[PDB]
Design a binder for this molecule. Sequence first.
Ligand SMILES: CCCC[C@@H]1CC[C@]2(C)[C@@H]([C@H](C)CCCC(C)(C)O)CC[C@H]2/C1=C/C=C1C[C@@H](O)C[C@H](O)C1
Lengths: 11, 233
Amino acid sequence: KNHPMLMNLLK
Amino acid sequence: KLSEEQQHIIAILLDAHHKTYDPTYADFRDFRPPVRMSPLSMLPHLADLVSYSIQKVIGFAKMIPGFRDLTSDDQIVLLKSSAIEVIMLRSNQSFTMDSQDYKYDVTDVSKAGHTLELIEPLIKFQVGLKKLNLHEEEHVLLMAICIVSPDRPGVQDAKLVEAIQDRLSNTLQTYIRCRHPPPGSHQLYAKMIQKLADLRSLNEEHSKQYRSLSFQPENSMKLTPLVLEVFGN
Ligand SMILES: CCCC[C@@H]1CC[C@]2(C)[C@@H]([C@H](C)CCCC(C)(C)O)CC[C@H]2/C1=C/C=C1C[C@@H](O)C[C@H](O)C1
């Protein structure tokens, strides 16, 4: 799956 | 006997933790309120608590020396697999072997859709960890070491993760030797690594009950988007 929110929070 | 780099690492993790852990619970007010009366009545509140806590764990993880050297993908895998474990770890700071609204007990967790199969060993964990009476320096090192684990499924550059962790591991082992006086230091590192082993087992059981819980769309409905993304959907 994709993790846009996790990706965004990790910068 | 702590190098300047190791002291640097501790100072960084201490500040990182201070910037991501608010002991005053100022933010808990913004969560869906806890309901105690009650099937899954605490699910909305604890889901928000966990979602909030994931955000804080991520903010902590980003400030771990060397963590920024990993690829985006490896950063994701490490956070996804360790999140629940670090939340359990960091929660030890609020755990007491003795507010009132945001003080959680067995029945609360049970009202979030979990069984004693998880709750019993989770309490054993908290008690055993509390017993170690870790310095805060050791506490923050343990959370960082937990996050940067080579053996997490899906890791690509395991050698790099391991190298980043060894640096954190050596810092802890040296800190204990130089700063933690006996008897309290007796086998302290081994006991801390065992806690990490305990956490893998707590992680697996939580995963199981989360799959069961989130299988019902009416319960999945009570979660948050971040929880669904991190813990699965
Ligand atoms: C015995 C320890 C306190 C118990 C308290 C309640 C139950 C929680 C949320 C645990 C449950 C197994 C998680 C439920 C998550 C769900 C998505 C519903 O499966 C994880 C950490 C636990 C808890 C964590 C507590 C805090 C408060 C504070 O220490 C900040 C932390 O980030 C989160």
